[PDB]
Amino acid sequence: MVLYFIGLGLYDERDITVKGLEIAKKCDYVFAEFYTSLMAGTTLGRIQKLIGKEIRVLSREDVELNFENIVLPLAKENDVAFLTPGDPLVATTHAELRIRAKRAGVESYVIHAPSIYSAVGITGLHIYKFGKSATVAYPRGNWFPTSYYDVIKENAERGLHTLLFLDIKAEKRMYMTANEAMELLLKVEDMKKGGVFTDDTLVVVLARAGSLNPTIRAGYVKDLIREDFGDPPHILIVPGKLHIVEAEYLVEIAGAPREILRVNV
């Protein structure tokens, strides 16, 4: 009669909360999805061993098209858990799944976990200054999406930071790197000439948030474009004008050049 949406957190199997773990262990059935995002610091095997339950992985179609006949039926007469990377309901499509549960007469509860949305606080950038978020998508064939560029423009002109999720081919487990994202943005800039993203733009790269050893780097595109930030996942941020406290953190903790203290504040 109960369905639990449980977040797995940022990077590895220990990023789930104690609450989520204890509840998952008590569930008769445990499902999971790894298409909205991946848990790069662990494996399905390690997650299963921690929970002590067999985990049935669901594809995007299994969920978007058949959630009500795969998961809900069991949730009707058993306690069922649905695991997702990060924080449940951050992925735009998950919220609606609670409506499906209601429609099927199944109770649902949400057990939160750390999300990259809040984890960016580790970059020293004030969370309240983050504006609208966007995803940098690989251009395919004759399709060259560029809306994320406009998101940066609108945020930055209002002095706000822009969190940029990078493209990922879930099932294929291949991530877009911050370097590729910077290359694409420079391409988009050369096409729109909005003076939004250039070699002189200050950016921040956050890699493997959740890990004890994440890579946090800040600097100008011209210097970071070919830098090695380590293994995925990568997150790219284009900050707006900086409060001196943010700039000093980027310098002391993210190795940013002293130049940002006079150019970006």
Place this chain on the structure above:
Amino acid sequence: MVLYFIGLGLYDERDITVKGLEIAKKCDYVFAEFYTSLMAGTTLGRIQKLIGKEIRVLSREDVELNFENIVLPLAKENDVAFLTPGDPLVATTHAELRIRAKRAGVESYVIHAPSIYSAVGITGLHIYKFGKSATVAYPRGNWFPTSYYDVIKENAERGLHTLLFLDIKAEKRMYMTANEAMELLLKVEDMKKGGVFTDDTLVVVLARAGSLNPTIRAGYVKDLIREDFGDPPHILIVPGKLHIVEAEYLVEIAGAPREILRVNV
């Protein structure tokens, strides 16, 4: 010899991540602050019991003025943890504490935890659509804060949602309710008359996120301003233009007026 900033999460002691718990259990000294937010589902005793360590609680003055005199000295020869509600670096000024650690020759690590900043996904509003955030502060003396009103205006004009953290006076055990936040906003509206926040404005209230049964309500100010949303903490959200699926969730899960389903594209 290390300093760990470890988040405890949204509501109770089990909102800590497994990673955070396992690390905290092995620290030599554990400090904490409980003035940045309210964890309404636990007690210091219960947290101490879970971690198996004695927790020294610090006040805002202890941290802001003497972090380097109370915590850092021990971190030089021992494994020390500093615990905070929610995520340690979200809507706090704790990030700067890492600079103090650096200058004192102490390496620091951050362990994230569920944050209200991302937990708002449970309202059904798309997280990427949230713009700049703000805090509704209690007026004091002849000083009556109003910036949060301009934030709402700016975000709304772009069709973005606005997350409003509500004030807290931990030492006086005063926690601003969504009702009090709405009353203050109506006063600012009369003062500025920008048509930003009125009785017909749609708002969303989220109380005690993290608990298994948080209060999630959506409706017009005129109808919710006197509604009892239960015990604190409370967060107030002023949505921008809604997507049809956001409206559906607000109606189905947050009991919003069925008339909002009819969006004005």
